[PDB]
Design a protein around this ligand. Structure first.
Ligand SMILES: O=c1ccn([C@@H]2O[C@H](COP(=O)(O)OP(=O)(O)O)[C@@H](O)[C@H]2O)c(=O)[nH]1
Ligand SMILES: OC[C@H]1O[C@@H](O)[C@H](O)[C@@H](O)[C@@H]1O
Ligand SMILES: OC[C@H]1O[C@@H](O)[C@H](O)[C@@H](O)[C@@H]1O
Length: 431
């Protein structure tokens, strides 16, 4: 009252992989003194408030106000556990379509609430991390940025480029690319038809193939320069690469006594993400193999942690302080989740990738193609392949030096500075 900031409105899908990439970008933008506000359901309000971001609650009467954060996706993964071992084409129909039906339900539920919040907050910029189009954002008249927190293969979508979600070779011939595009379009025809009718009901022009509209302003993604798909040309039109969106801040308990770190031996973080460990039978299988390893494991045990025991070379908990753990381990065993994958590299750690579904398969392929890890299907991987791959990566000086240099390049990237200049040029013209 007696004395170039902006108000930034973040709309993430209600899951860790979207929320944690938005918190990571918000932390980076708050260093420039921007005010970041989050539109999230009630169960996510106090957890996001612990990072000193303002929260605008959106109603979702299909999920209780006080539900555990891991129950929604955990229950879903348990309900579809039989699909996790199937080929990527069986998964697309039996799992990814059921999964995107829940994204579409949530989009419809929140979309009608966003216009009132936009009128009240009057943000300068909207940032959305969603897998489907939001009409309230398209129609807001405000500049908006689409945030890609998953592997970025989908952004390269174009003639002769393999579609995402199948772990396809970057060498895939145009005949195979079309075969997969036709499989996707036939598989999605009913879901897309219903979703396009909803877009039309709100005055938005559907996409021919996609059900996620690109921002006409800017599209920001999280992927290391050293890993990016330069095989398919430069950074795509109206896209912007950040090497990472690692929050760094994590105010959650460690999950276990820190005295485990005093135990002598190589340390391995074994996390299948925020929902992968909900396949109890897979976790009991992988824990039985790793119990034969001479190394020490910290395990992200997930929603059903009370249904299974870890052997004595291991410690774990339902949910861990992964920001606290990563710098203190030697190797990560993960599912190829794009946050976990990039967090592992930020800290300069090699990885064993066990993809469950979707974009994980593309990070499985990428770990092998860029020689920064080893990839296997978790349900079929043999005892010998998994234990020998752990020793191989721990003792491979050339691959460890490779991932250390990638870690340094990620941590020392100044791309957020160029991002900040772009969003300022966009806000100046559009209000
Ligand atoms: O024990 C855990 C398990 C997960 N995470 C975080 O939850 C997010 C999971 O997202 P990701 O894309 O890695 O996998 P998803 O859970 O989305 O499949 C990541 O940011 C992890 O850092 C964590 O902090 N502690
Ligand atoms: O939850 C949405 C998605 O987040 C992404 O960052 C991960 O790659 C996927 O494992 C996950 O399905
Ligand atoms: O490729 C874009 C996204 O499509 C979704 O249907 C999948 O569940 C995600 O894993 C993927 O990242």
């Amino acid at each position: 009252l007696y004395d170039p900031f902006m108000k930034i409105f973040f709309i993430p899908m209600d899951a860790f992989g979207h929320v944690n990439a938005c918190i990571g970008l918000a932390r980076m933008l708050s260093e420039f003194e921007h005010q970041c506000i989050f539109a999230v359901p009630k169960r996510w309000c106090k957890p996001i408030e612990e990072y000193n971001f303002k929260v605008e609650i959106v109603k979702d009467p299909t999920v209780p106000d006080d539900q555990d954060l891991q129950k929604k996706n955990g229950d879903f993964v348990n309900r579809y556990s039989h699909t996790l071992s199937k080929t990527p084409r069986e998964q697309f129909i039996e799992l990814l379509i059921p999964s995107i039906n829940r994204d579409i339900h949530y989009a419809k539920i929140i979309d009608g609430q966003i216009p009132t919040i936009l009128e009240s907050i009057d943000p300068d910029l909207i940032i959305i991390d969603f897998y489907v189009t939001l009409p309230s954002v398209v129609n807001s008249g405000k500049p908006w940025i689409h945030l890609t927190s998953c592997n970025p293969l989908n952004l390269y979508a174009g003639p002769n480029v393999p579609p995402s979600c199948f772990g396809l070779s970057i060498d895939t011939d145009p005949d195979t690319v079309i075969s997969y595009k036709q499989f996707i379009a036939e598989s999605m025809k009913d879901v897309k038809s219903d979703f396009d009718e909803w877009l039309v009901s709100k005055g938005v022009k559907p996409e021919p193939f996609a059900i996620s509209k690109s921002s006409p302003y800017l599209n920001v993604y999280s992927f290391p320069s050293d890993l990016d798909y330069s095989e398919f040309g430069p950074v795509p039109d109206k896209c912007f690469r950040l090497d990472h969106m690692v929050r760094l801040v994590q105010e959650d308990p460690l999950g276990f006594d820190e005295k485990f770190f005093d135990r002598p031996g190589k340390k391995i973080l074994f996390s299948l993400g925020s929902m992968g460990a909900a396949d109890v039978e897979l976790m009991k299988r992988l824990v039985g193999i790793l119990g034969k390893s001479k190394h020490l494991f910290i395990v992200s045990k997930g929603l059903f942690h009370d249904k299974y025991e870890l052997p004595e070379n291991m410690i774990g908990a339902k949910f861990l302080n992964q920001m606290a753990i990563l710098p203190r381990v030697d190797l990560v065993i993960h599912h190829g989740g794009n946050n976990t994958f990039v967090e592992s590299l930020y800290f300069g750690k090699p990885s064993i990738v066990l993809p469950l579904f979707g974009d994980q398969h593309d990070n499985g392929r990428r770990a092998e193609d860029k020689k920064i890890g080893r990839s296997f299907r978790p349900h079929h991987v043999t005892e010998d392949e998994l234990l020998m791959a752990i020793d191989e990566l721990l003792n491979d000086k050339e691959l460890n030096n490779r991932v250390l240099k990638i870690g340094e390049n990620i941590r020392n990237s100044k791309s957020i500075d160029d991002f900040n200049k772009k969003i300022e040029e966009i806000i100046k013209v559009h209000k």
